[PDB]
Nucleic acid binder design. Sequence first.
DNA 1: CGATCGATGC
DNA 2: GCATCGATCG
Length: 556
Amino acid sequence: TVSRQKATGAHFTPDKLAEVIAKRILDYFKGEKNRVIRVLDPACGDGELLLAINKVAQSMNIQLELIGVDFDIDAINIANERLSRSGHKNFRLINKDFLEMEELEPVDIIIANPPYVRTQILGAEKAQKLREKFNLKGRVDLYQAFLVAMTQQLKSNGIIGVITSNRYLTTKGGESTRKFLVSNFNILEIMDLGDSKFFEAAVLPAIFFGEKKNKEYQKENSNVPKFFKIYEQSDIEASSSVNSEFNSLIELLEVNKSGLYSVEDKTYSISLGKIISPENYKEPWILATEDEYEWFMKVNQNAYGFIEDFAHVKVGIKTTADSVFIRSDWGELPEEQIPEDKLLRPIISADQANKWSVSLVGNNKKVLYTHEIRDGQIKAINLEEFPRAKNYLESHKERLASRKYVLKANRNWYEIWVPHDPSLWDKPKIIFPDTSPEPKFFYEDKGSVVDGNCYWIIPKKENSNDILFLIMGICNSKFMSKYHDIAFQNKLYAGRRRYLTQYVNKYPIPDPESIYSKEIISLVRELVNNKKETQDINEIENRIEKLILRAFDIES
DNA sequence: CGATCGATGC
DNA sequence: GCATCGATCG
Ligand SMILES: Nc1ncnc2c1ncn2[C@@H]1O[C@H](CSCC[C@H](N)C(=O)O)[C@@H](O)[C@H]1O
């Protein structure tokens, strides 16, 4: 199920992309450049990065000592053959685990593309060892441990050029990585390659260039960190101009002017600017232009608060066996195994998501809910009281009992892993999908369950009314989409944002007592009650955009 | 406990 | 194309 390429992260850097990284490294290198420079690739694969940096260095008449490490002998054998045939004799390859889970003196240059292996593939046990050894936190990825490991092999004032997944820039679990990078390096440049798809794998990579700090120093300050951001721009503004003077996508990585660029069948939006105070490592690092960052600043100052202050942003249920607990064909089961109607709760998924109004006009999904309120406490149901539902779960005994995290928690083998509080489903709530290219927050007061591909919003104050309607009008607006693309830059392919709790908690909210917020609430109340409204919903939506702009005191 | 994260995945 | 869904961590 898990390929050897998946578990070992064996994806080689393309030809032209490796050359781009090598050119930027040797341009940033302030070292001597007339002696032998030692270069390290801590996961060299077939030697692609070492070949690229030597080809560039030989043009500059620089002599390199190439060092490559890889724990796979097959990669070492092919890299030895390629390096030997290149003509360069001063190279050295080591077959070992670089993380050390027999010596090497520090190097002047590191060029790297470490493997990206998620915590689930590493396993919980190996992930704990990596966190304890390399001082990492959260859902650690392998490239994060390599980042710490390879940095400790770099001389002070040495240059690093390393390409990884861009997810440390915006995820909560990237906090330890951001802290380590800004602490150990004078950040030279961060390149967010976005959804350009240089690799055959579905990944959005970032390239980090930095000069390792020396323990004795100055103020630096003469170095201000810059960024380069390129994403696929599908929709083009009617008044925006496109530059088509570049032939290949790899040439766009060396442009030095922000704007729209078209290569073949796709248009790209390239942004250049400065990293703004990366020492604040607890929030995502924002890569935005001067105008975008200033607009982002004035919204926060004029904001009355944030969603986190007014409501609980929760995830839907996580059964950890969706094809067993969530079905639409309950009536088509054998009558001996059709669960009792008390247990089958209608559940809303992401494929029924629209703005304001739910697409519940066509739905039949129900969840076999396994929890209930008993003596004022949340307890799992007793199977003896539900014979038909018991037989159904008996047929799935081996798979449901395989969930080791359920048994080590001393919970019943048949339970839903995250059922939440059964009493909270009755409250009015906002629902929205996680993976979506557009906000689809909608009101729902029929007391149904929310699926794991959606999040839901319930107020902190027990007045489940106007406050939810205000939050909807804010979240669904184009105003908040602009704010989102600046502050929370976590994108999947095809322009999909991630509407996660850690992001939606930070949405700004205006004063719910101002006359502007009062009119927004009345318009949102109309959009959910008047399902006879069609097409001219856009008319109401436009009135909300101008109201939100006056509520935050800005014209965008 | 309850939200995260995805060299996405099928 | 286009929207995971289940191990995981705190
Ligand atoms: N623990 C470890 N120690 C050393 N190498 C490792 C490793 N885990 C994975 N690798 C190696 O890291 C490589 C990542 S693919 C990167 C290859 C090369 N850097 C390039 O850009 O083309 C794989 O070949 C894999 O064999």
